[PDB]
Ligand binder design. Structure first.
Ligand SMILES: [Zn+2]
Ligand SMILES: [Zn+2]
Ligand SMILES: [Zn+2]
Ligand SMILES: [Zn+2]
Lengths: 67, 66
């Protein structure tokens, strides 16, 4: 069960209390999707995308300039 | 290499040599300038600015304190 209004990780399926009880943080992507710190971390070792919506959540900080 | 010269510190090509074969001039956010080809290469197996070593990979997630 995953009652609406509750904050849990869609990957490990832990609730808010379980996530914080062992030192993990609640995190959010810029695209608004919530995970525990540890599952999003593993996930991003091997992708630039949000587990939930697949939108890229990296930002190589460089860009063309047009002199 | 006088001030105002636009060139790549990696391949050593100047602004004309860069645009003539289809590369773009680029800049990291720390203000460092490369050709698009050399910078891109450097970032395949690394995530730092080839010039100053600052991390230039901004993964867009953060803690929320509830
Ligand atoms: Zn989790
Ligand atoms: Zn997302
Ligand atoms: Zn170059
Ligand atoms: Zn730099």
């Amino acid at each position: 069960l995953r009652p609406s209004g509750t904050v849990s990780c869609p990957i490990c399926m832990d609730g808010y209390s379980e996530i914080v009880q062992n030192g993990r943080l609640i995190v959010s992507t810029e695209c608004g999707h919530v995970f525990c710190s540890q599952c999003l971390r593993d996930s991003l070792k091997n992708a630039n995308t949000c587990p939930t919506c697949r939108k890229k959540i990296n930002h190589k900080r460089y860009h063309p300039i047009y002199i």
